[PDB]
Amino acid sequence: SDTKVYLLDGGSLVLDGYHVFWNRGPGGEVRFPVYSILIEHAEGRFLIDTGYDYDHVMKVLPFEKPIQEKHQTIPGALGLLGLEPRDIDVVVNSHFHFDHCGGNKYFPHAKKICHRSEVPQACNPQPFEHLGYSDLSFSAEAAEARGATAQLLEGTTRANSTFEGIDGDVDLARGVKLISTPGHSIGHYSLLVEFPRRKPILFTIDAAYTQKSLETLCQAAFHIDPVAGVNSMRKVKKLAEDHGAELMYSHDMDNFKTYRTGTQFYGHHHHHH
């Protein structure tokens, strides 16, 4: 069956404008959305990222003032589509900052995929990365390494939280490509989805928070290598041009309000014939 993309609306968080636009700002509170990307594909149901865990943010990062209603948890968002976590075959994480892996705990049955460097980074991050990598409930191994086993959902084991590590640009499935875009994090991935009858979508994820971020090459203040970060923005600019792909950003409220979420999706049949 034809590839469809559903965006799982995961509520919102707040940072300073200086967090969102490194050094440029302007300052002041900025609320931004968090979402995950569900692909219904011939080869299976693939979930890219799993949003944030509300209790985690309220305990560890309450200054981010999370707003997330019951339909904006991963199980809640899947429920809107008549699905449950057990329906997802593969979970892919762009990276393991807390706002992209907070729902992994619900998928012990799924195959898990991430960049090869990301699990080791969560186990032993740079000192300035501890708060980004603060939810280790996605990995028994990383939780153990970080002294955070108390975060683990009951039933989580090393066996059911082991990732297949990947590297470079790689095909997840037919017309679904993971685009290596490191800098924001050591193994950060963006996502390119191709369709049978509409143009590709390039999900920048955290390689570019907002359209303005890309336009100005002003990345987020959270990064491990801002030189890599800029080069990954250029890679994204070009890949979208070269593919005629449409760009969708991770944490851009104005743009997010134009995005289909919930039961609305990308990849409609055309009724041409």
- Tell me: does residue 197 bind Cl ion (CB under 5 A): no
Residue with smallest beta-carbon separation from Cl ion: 268
Residue 232 · residue 209 · CB < 8 Å: no
Confirm or deny that 71 is annotated as ligand binding: no
Residue 64 · residue 57 · CB < 8 Å: yes
The residue among 64, 96, 67 whose CA lies nearest residue 104 is 96
Confirm or deny that 268 is annotated as ligand binding: no
Q: How remote is the C-alpha of 231 from its chain's centroid?
A: 20
Q: What number of chain residues touch Cl ion (CB under 5 A)?
A: 3
The Cα 48–Cα 104 span in angstroms is 10
Classified as helix, coil or strand, 4 is strand
Calculate ∠ Cα 94-12-258, nearest 5°.
Answer: 85
- Tell me: does residue 22 bind a copy of itself (CB under 8 A): yes
Catalytic residues: 99
Confirm or deny that 184 is annotated as ligand binding: yes
- Tell me: does residue 130 bind Cl ion (CB under 5 A): no
Site for a copy of itself in 111-130 (CB under 8 A): 126-128
58 binds, among a copy of itself, Cl ion, Zn ion, none (CB under 5 to 8 A by kind): none
Measured from the CB of residue 259, what is the shortest distance to a copy of itself in angstroms? 27
Instruction: For the beta carbon of residue 109, count every other beta carbon within 10 angstroms.
Output: 12
Q: x/- site string to a copy of itself, residues 221 to 240, per CB under 8 A?
A: xxxxxxx--x----------
148 binds, among Cl ion, Zn ion, a copy of itself, none (CB under 5 to 8 A by kind): none
Q: In the set 14, 18, 169, 194, which binds a copy of itself (CB under 8 A)?
A: 18
Calculate ∠ Cα 39-43-44, nearest 5°.
Answer: 50
Confirm or deny that 251 is annotated as ligand binding: yes
Binding residues for Zn(2+): 95, 97, 99-100, 184, 206, 251
